[PDB]
Amino acid sequence: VMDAFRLINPQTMMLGQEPRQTTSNLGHLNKPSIQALIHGLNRHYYSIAINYRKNELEEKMLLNLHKKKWNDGLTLKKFDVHSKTNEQTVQEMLGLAIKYNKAVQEEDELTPEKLVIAKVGRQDAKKHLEEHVSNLMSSNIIQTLGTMLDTVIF
Amino acid sequence: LAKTVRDEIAGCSEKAYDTLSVNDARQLLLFSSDKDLLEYIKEEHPEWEIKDGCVVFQKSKDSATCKEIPSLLLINQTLSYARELERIV
């Protein structure tokens, strides 16, 4: 959130003339803020359209910033802790499964979608089931890759 | 067919017994003379060692026993499974 402004000559305003000549529509691309319309926009001053000049080397270095350490994939999780997370998430899948079975069964012919959005079984048994299976798969299978690419190369 | 049967019998004997007495080796392969069994062993199956009148079958390092294969290869088979699986995800 940034903007640039320059003043409109009061003499031009008193003359009723448009303060600038517009051969290009770029100035109107950004819809001004109703606050600015309250704060004197286009009566005392005007906005200036903003773009960003970006150098390619700056972009290479910027991309380098978010690059995780190439070793971070090597940092394997402790087997005991990983297994306990698996256990807990499996029990959570059990709880969500039973909740969801009730939710599918209790669902009547006139099932209110609005009421379901406001309040569903265990927040939403289906959504938590999906997220938990996704995270469990991801963690197990990344641990898989890690352990064994180590096996090969070490 | 007799030659094939003798070869098959030799194959079974190699897996079955760690050692076999030469008399028994002749009896199972029905060789008429000692020199017959000796010649057969020398030509078809040189890996057999004859020690103190008993045929010593050089049993494989790890074969009959279960879970006696390579670790890295199995586990990297799990690599193939996992990586090919989720990359789709």
Coordinates of C-alpha atoms in Angstrom, one line a residue, chain B:
Chain B
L1 CA 15.1 -87.6 -21.0
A2 CA 17.4 -89.7 -18.8
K3 CA 20.1 -87.0 -19.1
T4 CA 17.6 -84.3 -18.3
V5 CA 16.4 -86.3 -15.3
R6 CA 19.9 -86.7 -14.0
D7 CA 20.5 -83.0 -14.3
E8 CA 17.2 -82.3 -12.4
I9 CA 18.2 -84.8 -9.7
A10 CA 21.6 -83.1 -9.4
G11 CA 19.9 -79.7 -9.1
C12 CA 17.6 -81.0 -6.3
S13 CA 20.5 -82.7 -4.5
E14 CA 22.5 -79.5 -4.5
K15 CA 19.7 -77.6 -2.7
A16 CA 18.7 -80.4 -0.4
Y17 CA 21.9 -81.7 1.2
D18 CA 25.0 -79.8 2.4
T19 CA 27.0 -83.0 1.8
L20 CA 26.2 -86.3 0.1
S21 CA 28.0 -89.6 0.3
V22 CA 29.4 -90.7 -3.0
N23 CA 27.6 -94.0 -2.7
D24 CA 24.3 -92.1 -2.3
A25 CA 25.3 -89.8 -5.1
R26 CA 25.6 -92.8 -7.4
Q27 CA 22.4 -94.4 -6.1
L28 CA 20.3 -91.3 -6.7
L29 CA 21.7 -90.7 -10.2
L30 CA 21.9 -94.4 -10.9
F31 CA 25.5 -94.3 -12.1
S32 CA 26.8 -97.8 -12.8
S33 CA 30.5 -97.1 -11.9
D34 CA 32.3 -94.7 -9.6
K35 CA 34.2 -93.2 -12.6
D36 CA 30.8 -92.5 -14.2
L37 CA 29.8 -90.3 -11.3
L38 CA 33.2 -88.7 -11.2
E39 CA 33.1 -87.9 -14.9
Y40 CA 29.6 -86.4 -14.6
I41 CA 30.6 -84.3 -11.7
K42 CA 33.8 -83.1 -13.4
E43 CA 32.0 -82.1 -16.7
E44 CA 28.5 -80.9 -15.8
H45 CA 29.0 -79.5 -12.3
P46 CA 32.6 -78.5 -11.5
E47 CA 31.4 -76.5 -8.4
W48 CA 30.9 -79.8 -6.5
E49 CA 33.8 -80.6 -4.1
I50 CA 34.5 -84.3 -3.4
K51 CA 36.0 -84.5 0.1
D52 CA 36.6 -87.8 2.0
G53 CA 34.2 -89.7 -0.3
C54 CA 31.3 -87.3 0.1
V55 CA 30.1 -84.7 -2.4
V56 CA 30.2 -81.3 -0.8
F57 CA 27.4 -79.2 -2.3
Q58 CA 28.4 -75.5 -2.1
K59 CA 25.1 -74.2 -0.8
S60 CA 24.4 -70.5 -1.8
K61 CA 25.4 -67.8 0.7
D62 CA 21.8 -66.7 1.3
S63 CA 18.9 -68.5 -0.6
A64 CA 16.6 -70.9 1.4
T65 CA 16.5 -68.5 4.4
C66 CA 13.9 -65.7 4.2
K67 CA 14.6 -61.9 4.5
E68 CA 18.2 -62.7 3.5
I69 CA 18.5 -60.3 0.5
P70 CA 20.1 -56.8 0.0
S71 CA 18.9 -53.9 2.2
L72 CA 19.7 -50.8 0.1
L73 CA 17.9 -52.3 -2.9
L74 CA 14.7 -53.2 -1.0
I75 CA 14.6 -49.9 0.7
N76 CA 15.2 -47.9 -2.5
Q77 CA 12.4 -50.0 -4.0
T78 CA 10.4 -48.1 -1.3
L79 CA 12.0 -45.0 -2.7
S80 CA 10.5 -45.7 -6.1
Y81 CA 7.1 -46.4 -4.5
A82 CA 7.0 -43.3 -2.3
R83 CA 8.5 -40.7 -4.8
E84 CA 6.5 -41.9 -7.7
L85 CA 3.4 -41.9 -5.6
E86 CA 3.3 -38.4 -4.1
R87 CA 5.0 -36.5 -6.9
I88 CA 1.5 -37.0 -8.5
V89 CA 0.0 -35.4 -5.4

